[PDB]
Symmetry: none
Subunit: 76 residues, 6 copies
């Protein structure tokens, strides 16, 4: 028999920020230290290893707002 699909999501949504100032921000961490010892590394399928990383990050967006949309129709 007849199959009919109407997929019609509607979106008027708004993500809004006012800020009067960002400033006087001081990221001043002391000296980090890292050691790793390992004797063999053996990686096979879809492995996503990270070893011994040392990150200092200072992220200061005037907005930094996120809107994420996922729309899926699957038919068999």
């Amino acid at each position: 028999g007849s199959v009919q699909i109407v997929y019609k999501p509607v979106d008027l949504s708004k993500v809004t920020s006012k800020c009067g100032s960002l400033g006087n921000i001081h990221h001043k961490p002391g000296g980090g230290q890292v050691e790793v010892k390992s004797e063999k590394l053996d990686f096979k399928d879809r492995v996503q290893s990270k070893i011994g990383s040392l990150d200092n990050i200072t992220h200061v967006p005037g907005g930094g707002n996120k809107k994420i949309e996922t729309h899926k129709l699957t038919f068999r």
Copy 2:
């Protein structure tokens, strides 16, 4: 027999921030230290390892609002 689907979500939502100022922010941790000792690493399928990482992060968005929407229709 006849199959009819109407998928019609509607969204007028708003995510809103007012801020008068961000500032005088001091991320000042003392010196971190990390050590890892291991004998063999042997990773097979879809492994997502992290070893011995050391992160300092200072994230200061003026907004930083998140709206996340997932819409799925599955038919067989």
Copy 3:
């Protein structure tokens, strides 16, 4: 019998950031140190390794707003 799909997502959404000023940001991390020791690395299929990475990042966009859209229609 007949199969009919109407896929008609509609989107008027807006992501808005006002910031009065960005300034006076100081990323002054201390001297980091990293060591990694290994004898053999043996990587095969879809491996995405990182070893010993030291990073300092200062990211200060006037916007930094993200709108992300994924649309998938799959038929069999």
Copy 4:
């Protein structure tokens, strides 16, 4: 005062074997099989390890009687 030691062991002993024949000897064992699986071997002081050995021995001496002589004098 005066110390006198006389160490004077005497030995006239005899170890004797008579045999009319050795023979018609058949060392015919079926095929042996050995497996060892281990992660690490880490040996420190005066270690005398044997791992996974497989011995067939056929020892057929005409005598097999034993003489070894060891003499030690230690003074302080």
Copy 5:
């Protein structure tokens, strides 16, 4: 005071073997098989390791004789 040592061991001992024949000896073992897997070997002081040996030995001395003499005098 005076120290006197007379160390005067005496030995007339005899080791005697008579055999009328050695023979018709058949060392015929089936095929041996050995496997060893280990990931690291790490040996430090006076280590005397053997790994995965496979020995067939046929020893048939009529005499084969060993006389071993060790004499030590140590003074301080």
Copy 6:
């Protein structure tokens, strides 16, 4: 005071073999097989390793005789 040592071991001792015949000896082992797998070997002080040896030995002395002497005098 006076220290006197007489070290005077005396030895008339004898090792003796008669054999009427050696012969008809058959060392016929089946085909041996050995495998060893290891990823690193790290040996330091007075290490005496053997790995994966495969010995067939046939030893058949009528005489083959050994006399071994060690004499040590040490004074301080």
